[PDB]
Amino acid sequence: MRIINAEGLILGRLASKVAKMLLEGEEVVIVNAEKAVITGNRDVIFKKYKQRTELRTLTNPRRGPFYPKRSDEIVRRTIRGMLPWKTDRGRKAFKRLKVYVGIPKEFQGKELETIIEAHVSRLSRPKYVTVGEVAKFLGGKF
């Protein structure tokens, strides 16, 4: 089991690496989902996520796309998008992932890994909005 501190990490690259590990067959726990960053313009990102949450089935809301609003759920769905979700292998790989906001009591005092391919130091300018800010705009709990 590998624990990854999502603080100061690019969401897409972190999700790609984590999906790769899950497919190779490891157990991954992400510990700081609310601190992941998304580069771009704040208004554009907010509009995109608002439209994603607005997607729903007209004939029955109980079947519509349930796009997430919490930070950990946003990270989980981003990772799920990079997996063969429509296959047994993809479902099993997704079942080996846990995402949390903040460090839970059970993970305190443990080794927290990081991905240098997703750190914010790669960016020329730090123009990004955190998943926590996105969830706050969307109205999620955290």
Partner: protein, 86 residues
């Protein structure tokens, strides 16, 4: 002996070759390290204890993966599973 992970079949985007598998050994991360394993056997264990035999024939890519040819192809439940080199 060495431990390895079965990654996938030898494949294109929409074509699959059943008797060749891609295997990643634990502590190899280059073609130079992976080339030392050419000619070594690869063993896979079935749930009932049956042993399936293959041999490493070529390196794959540049990150340390290798190609193993199996006389009888792996079932496909071996994807992401562990195999023994030698």
């Amino acid at each position: 002996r060495i431990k390895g992970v079965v990654l996938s079949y030898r494949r294109s985007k929409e074509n699959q070759h059943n008797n060749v598998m891609i295997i990643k050994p634990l502590d190899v991360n280059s073609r130079e390290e992976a080339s030392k394993l050419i000619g070594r056997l690869v063993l896979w264990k079935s749930p009932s204890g049956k042993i399936l035999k293959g041999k490493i024939v070529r390196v794959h890519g540049t990150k340390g993966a290798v190609r193993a040819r199996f006389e009888k192809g792996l079932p496909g439940q071996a994807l992401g599973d562990y195999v023994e080199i030698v």
